[PDB]
Amino acid sequence: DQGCAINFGKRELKCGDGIFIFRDSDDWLNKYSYYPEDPVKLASIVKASFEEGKCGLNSVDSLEHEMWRSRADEINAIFEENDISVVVQDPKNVYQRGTHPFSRIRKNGSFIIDGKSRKECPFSNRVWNSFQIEEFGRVYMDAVFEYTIDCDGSILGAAVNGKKSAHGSPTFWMGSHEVNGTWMIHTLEALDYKECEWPLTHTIGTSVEESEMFMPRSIGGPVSSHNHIPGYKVQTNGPWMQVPLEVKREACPGTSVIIDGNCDGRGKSTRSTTDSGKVIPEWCCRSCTMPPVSFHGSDGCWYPMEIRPR
Amino acid sequence: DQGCAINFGKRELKCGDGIFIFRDSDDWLNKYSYYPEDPVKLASIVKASFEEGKCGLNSVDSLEHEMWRSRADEINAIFEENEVDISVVVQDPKVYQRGTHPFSRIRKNGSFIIDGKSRKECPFSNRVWNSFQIEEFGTGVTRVYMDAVFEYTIDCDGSILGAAVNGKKSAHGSPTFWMGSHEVNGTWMIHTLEALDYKECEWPLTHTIGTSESEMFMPRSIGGPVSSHNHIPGYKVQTNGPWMQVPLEVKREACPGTSVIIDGNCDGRGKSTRSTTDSGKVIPEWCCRSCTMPPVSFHGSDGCWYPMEIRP
């Protein structure tokens, strides 16, 4: 990796060789060309998997969904030639957990790629995480017949430096820093809602319990010391199911939080506006930090589980 | 951090933002100009430590030793001008060991030996080891600034470390250490390891990658990441290894003029032994228990050495 970074805090320019992790993989929104195994073996794989009694798939991330939407037509043409057709519907960005791996090779039935749990096949009868990537990047994919719950490590990244760190992915970016001795989040952009856990071999400083972390493990978020914000426990019932998120350290427009010690807390997150689009600027919280945190997603301003409407 | 990686001939260019670590920290050998706390208060600190019963210091890294060598004279001059019967002399550990005291808080020619042989009068007990912290990492056109600390700590300083992982690639870094792992057919395994000192500060738990103590190649106490990335298959922890040498280079190749054959009959797990004997003659009769086909061999001061699993 022959490159040439430049800092501005410590004022370096140092060039040479090493390891680089770019965020801009979060910005190359559509440049990949996902080529699965081949236009033949994949067809037989899905045909067999349907023939065993798996109604439809369940994408794991936006990359899988894009690949399937682009390559449904080739598989349909192949089957035409050699009684099943794949119809790729749309989840907004809320890829949930399927509970089956692919199956081994040996009316108009359908293999819905990721559809609503319409009482005809629940999430139980779906294949979720049964691909793995061989080339970093055009990306080639290979099928797998073993169930897994950890995300694919071939596309992840992590890095630490002097008082700086960053957990990356093409659809995720968390950036921590150390101030006054401790490590705490300061950037967080999520473009999906995955449910694959972060692998241990790509976490930095795995020496924590799952009770101080900000982003929970199941939603997919590194299990480390860098992943937590002081004064806030795990965000189980957070606003994680939304479209592109951003965790921000500022009170949401028109509202205010006054640090108290008498108002109940630790329930579920609540939007700043009511169901009729009216703000409620009467927010309290228990012992929290001086500024509040607030997500910025699909509906807009949400608040963490420690900030309640008084 | 707006930098990028370039491919020659292919003439691609991918710039942006992120985190960048470079090996070349093990290439830039002499540009640092270390500045201590200040010319005046460091003198008072070492004077107070001497008054409380600490014979001398003990450097931990090459950076501290070079700083002391460069800046002993200023402290000597300040001491002279303040009329005090002390003077610091700095010797030369070729191998930095462990003291047991932090700097003491401020409130015939005595000797405050920086790092010299344990001459049965100033043992390691009366020595200060790890009492500094880099605050700013300089500007350059680098000038590392150091601030005292009065609490004993056995971890190294994180302001100069760095770790990174990517698709099937990893690297733990320092200006005096570079381990680089990769993932081939399953697990992770070292493929490059260059050490320039013999430190004894443990790697910090917050700058490791995959912290999930009997398979690690480089031991913990010598100072080496506690991670799954830190091991070589078939070779267990290197307690009595050849770590005490000047720049090492863990190489995966047979040693010159020798030969290794895997055997299920010979002894193992002893101590590291050099390829050439005490008289400069090789011994090409090397055996190994369960090991791997390409043997590993530390290349240090005297040349070839061998791990603890390979015996003559």
Numbering used by the authors:
A (entry chain a): 1 to 82, 85 to 108, 129 to 159, 166 to 338
B (entry chain A): 1 to 94, 96 to 108, 129 to 162, 165 to 235, 238 to 337
Which of the paper's sentences describe this entry?
As the multifunctional protein within the Flaviviridae family, Non-structural protein 1 (NS1) is considered as a promising target against flaviviruses. Moreover, the sNS1 lipoprotein is involved in virion production, immune evasion, and multiple aspects of pathogenesis. The NS1 monomer has 352 amino acids, forms 2 α-helices and 20 β-strands, and contains 12 conserved cysteine residues that form 6 intramolecular disulfide bonds. The NS1 monomer consists of three distinct domains: a β-roll domain (residues 1–29, β1–2), a wing domain (residues 38–151, β4–7 and α1–2), and a β-ladder domain (residues 181–352, β10–20). β3, β8, and β9 are from a ‘‘connector’’ domain (residues 30–37 and 152–180) and connect the wing to the β-roll and β-ladder domains.
The local resolution map shows that one of the dimers is blurry with a worse resolution, indicating its flexibility. Then, we performed focused refinement by applying a mask on one of the dimers and improved the resolution to 3.31 Å. The atomic models of the YFV_NS1_tetramer and focused refined dimer were built according to the density map. Generally, all flavivirus NS1 dimers have a cross shape, formed by the intertwining of Monomer A and a, showing two distinct surfaces. The β-roll domain, the greasy finger (loopβ8–β9), and loopβ5–β6 in the wing periphery region form the ‘inner’ hydrophobic face, while the wing domain and β-ladder form the outer surface. In addition, we also use the Alpha fold to generate the 3D model of the YFV NS1 dimer. The structural comparison showed that the RMSD of the two dimers structures is 0.847 Å, suggesting the modelled dimer structure is very similar to that of the YFV_NS1 dimer.
